[PDB]
A paper describes a structure:
Siroheme is the modified isobacteriochlorin tetrapyrrole used by siroheme-dependent sulfite and nitrite reductases (SiR/NiRs) in catalyzing the six-electron reduction of sulfite to sulfide or nitrite to ammonia. [name] is encoded by a gene fusion between a C-terminal SUMT (CysGA) and an N-terminal bifunctional dehydrogenase/ferrochelatase (CysGB). The N-terminal enzyme module, CysGB, is a three-domain bifunctional dehydrogenase/ATP-independent class III ferrochelatase12 that performs the final two steps of siroheme biosynthesis. The C-terminal enzyme module, CysGA, is homologous to a well-studied class of SAM-dependent uro’gen III methyltransferases (SUMTs) that catalyzes the methylations to generate precorrin-210,13.
D104 has been implicated in its chelatase activity but its exact role is unknown. Alteration to asparagine results in an enzyme with a severe growth defect, 10-fold lower dehydrogenase activity, and 200-fold lower chelatase activity. The [name] variant is also sensitive to addition of Co2+, but with the same dose–response as [name]. The D104A and [name] structures were determined to ensure that there were no gross structural defects that arose from the alterations that might impact their function. Indeed, both altered enzymes were crystallized and the structures are largely similar to Met8p. The asparagine side chain is pointed away from the tetrapyrrole binding pocket, toward the Rossmann fold, as D104 does in the apo structure. Presumably, in the [name] altered [name], the asparagine can reorient and partially act in the same capacity as the aspartic acid in catalyzing dehydrogenation and chelation. Asparagine rarely serves as a nucleophile, but there are some examples of proteases that use an asparagine in this capacity, so it may be sufficient to allow basal catalysis. It may also be sufficient to coordinate the water molecule that is poised over the tetrapyrrole nitrogens to prepare the tetrapyrrole for metal insertion, albeit less efficiently than the aspartate. As regards metal ion specificity, however, [name] is no more sensitive to increasing cobalt dose than [name], suggesting that metal ion specificity does not depend entirely on the nature of the ligand that recruits the metal to the tetrapyrrole.
Author numbering:
A (entry chain B): 1 to 272, 277 to 358, 363 to 455
B (entry chain A): 1 to 270, 277 to 359, 364 to 457
Amino acid sequence: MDHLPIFCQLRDRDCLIVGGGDVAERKARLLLEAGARLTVNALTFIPQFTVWANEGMLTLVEGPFDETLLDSCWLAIAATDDDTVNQRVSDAAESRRIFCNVVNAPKAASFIMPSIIDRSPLMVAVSAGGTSPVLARLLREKLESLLPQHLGQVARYAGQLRARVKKQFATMGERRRFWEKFFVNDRLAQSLANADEKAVNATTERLFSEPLDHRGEVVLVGAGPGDAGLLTLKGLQQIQQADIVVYDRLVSDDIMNLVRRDADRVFVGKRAVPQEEINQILLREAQKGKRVVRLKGGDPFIFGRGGEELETLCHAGIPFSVVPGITAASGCSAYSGIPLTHRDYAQSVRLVTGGGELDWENLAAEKQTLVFYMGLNQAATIQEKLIAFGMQADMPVALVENGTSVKQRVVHGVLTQLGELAQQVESPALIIVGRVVALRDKLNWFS
Amino acid sequence: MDHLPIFCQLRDRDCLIVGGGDVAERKARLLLEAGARLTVNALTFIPQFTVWANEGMLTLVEGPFDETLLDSCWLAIAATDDDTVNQRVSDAAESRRIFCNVVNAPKAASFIMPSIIDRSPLMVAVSAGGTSPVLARLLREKLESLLPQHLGQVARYAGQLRARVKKQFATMGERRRFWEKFFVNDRLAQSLANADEKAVNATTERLFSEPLDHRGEVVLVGAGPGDAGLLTLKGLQQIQQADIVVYDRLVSDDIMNLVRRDADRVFVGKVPQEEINQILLREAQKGKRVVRLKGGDPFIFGRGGEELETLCHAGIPFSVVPGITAASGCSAYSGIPLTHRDYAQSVRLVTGHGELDWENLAAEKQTLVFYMGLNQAATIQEKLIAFGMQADMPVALVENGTSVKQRVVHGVLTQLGELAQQVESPALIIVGRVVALRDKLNWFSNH
Ligand SMILES: Nc1ncnc2c1ncn2[C@@H]1O[C@H](CSCC[C@H](N)C(=O)O)[C@@H](O)[C@H]1O
Ligand SMILES: Nc1ncnc2c1ncn2[C@@H]1O[C@H](CSCC[C@H](N)C(=O)O)[C@@H](O)[C@H]1O
Ligand SMILES: [Cl-]
């Protein structure tokens, strides 16, 4: 072992930073977050130090490095640009047996500052001894995406409950299985976050009363339009903790690979399937006691037929929640370079399908952006009947197929070519109509 | 944070353990592995301690607690069963400003010993500070399953190439891009694992020979409506690697916790557009990774349709990460789907601050979403009524959607004026029959 990691309790302990630049500012902010009583010594200070001082959060000593400021210090940080000054700081702290960090020379120091994931009281720290800062940040970013930030509140509720858990589950296996359920229960985490005490004690005793086997809930998760990177953090966390994932073909293969592999997969899609038995699959599995995730393309509440499922769940007592996704309009907008609103261009955006009878006097009006979902089929009926209501023959139209994926194709023309453009593409495609289409020239970044 | 993690260099520094039992043994084993000059002072020793003193790896001091043995120490550990003795030790350590650990007492000591995952020279440390030891074990065991066995060899080799990387690459960014490609080359990993030197050398020379890009870029990232879990995975990648992050009023404080600690932050808030652009323009022209962080989605009422031409006119590469828009975030979190089987089959996103076409907005069977229409709410009510919307149409106002401070008021269209006086910005107005579904779909809390 090259370094001993220790977690230091710093509240009202004296600490010294030498330096007054932005490096020293980052260090000072960490130590203030830790509750340190902080003195800063520097020849000059960036103004963020004088505001912290005015608000009585630190102490400033303008001048050269004064070894006697270390006199009652627990930690020293040399954060200047002068290796000479840092070495004098480092040497003065060594003789007083004060742990000292040198920002630019981590080998010169008696301690190193690692990358930190703060879910306090829960804390994770990563370092490789200075050999690889970029590896630490790479690991920090993956850790950040996996640990929900309300985990800390769940942590402290746990500690206040270990007497009840131990007095109810005899074996340690029984206890670990309970804790494993406790720490991934999301109505619990949301209730502690939102400070709803009725829902905490409700969820608390529902956790104690149901069998250790059971953990029935259903989560409606938006997978977004295609790109695995457009999943939400909450979404990725939910499909990692799931026992069964129910998915359609509108969920891209890359999203599916993010499903941790001991989960059961249920495909409920096209081949070459009514929503009614989909409701009963979800119903069945939740009442067997499984964490069911329903993955849907895009956003669940935008042409998802996703509300119809949940009111069946609400009438059986099955807890549920919903994680929104990037809808196709927003993804294709961004990946094709067509903003949906802009300036003098479009006051409003309209999301519509292609069922029943629509109102095309309404759809034809100007100063709009029109986005057609599932419109490819009735597409010819759309060109002739927007022009037949006075909308200009020169209005740019665009079709985005497979938006946000590496197979994205965009065809753009003018309203009077709308049918011709149409089956140069296939489903799934969006039809976008309006002046905003004309700014793809200046705004397309996706190669 | 409640603790401050640090990685101490203990080689040739005196440490003192008080206690000579199995708990003292496990802490002694750790300090020995970190190179400490160890002294153990106890009435009695388990046999492993005498086996260590015979090899000259520690000094044993038999007898009761001697305070003077602290004099030259950098760390102290109270590991007796006697809690009176442990307190005399932590007292004697306090006065000397020596970080001290008390085994049966996490809240009583100035440092905590964390769980360690070791991939030397890489190291991950996990602690919940004694509030939840079992969360720390479950997490440590999950981390153990995500860190590849042979990651330590990749880190070690990185340590040996730093001198060469810094000599051959002038700028910080060029070094970062080298390391970014180094740490995700699968083949270099397996070659290091198999001690295949010629294969390591061939990939290494080729990696050093690659042309490295020298451009800064501006990334527009959607933060989503507030909840930090609603950021996309890509958006998190961006704000964890960014050099500077330009952000607004409407980026919640929990998203900012995701911004990399070493990044610079610039706030905007009446700061008009032409100063933002030239801030963006001048920062990227210096080769820095620039993230523009905006609330919701950048291309929906984002004003971000002209930021991008100024950059395209300048030769600055740019990209766009879509975000969850306030409509689909507030929809999911108030229990109000934007579309539904027989309630609404089109969604209209409208602004507030010729003018609006009210005959079209008042049309049947659509959901209306008003962005920043709080100050204009009495007009919206008047106009929709005059163009034929029924007086009893359900309306809802979502304030601070997806945040811990979310508030929803709701009612009928003849109440829309009065309702707006009960909330403040930022807030959405949802108009349509879907609003009535909240009483069957609200899985979120009570405001
Ligand atoms: N990746 C994609 N690219 C282009 N259009 C897409 C798309 N994904 C979905 N669509 C559109 O959405 C239709 C399915 S309706 C499902 C909508 C989804 N819940 C959402 O919010 O996006 C398809 O017929 C197609 O018109
Ligand atoms: N968390 C939230 N809850 C309710 N309304 C919100 C909100 N965040 C933004 N808004 C609305 O959005 C307006 C800002 S316009 C920018 C919104 C962003 N581009 C998006 O896609 O959502 C505010 O006036 C408010 O009406
Ligand atoms: Cl490192």
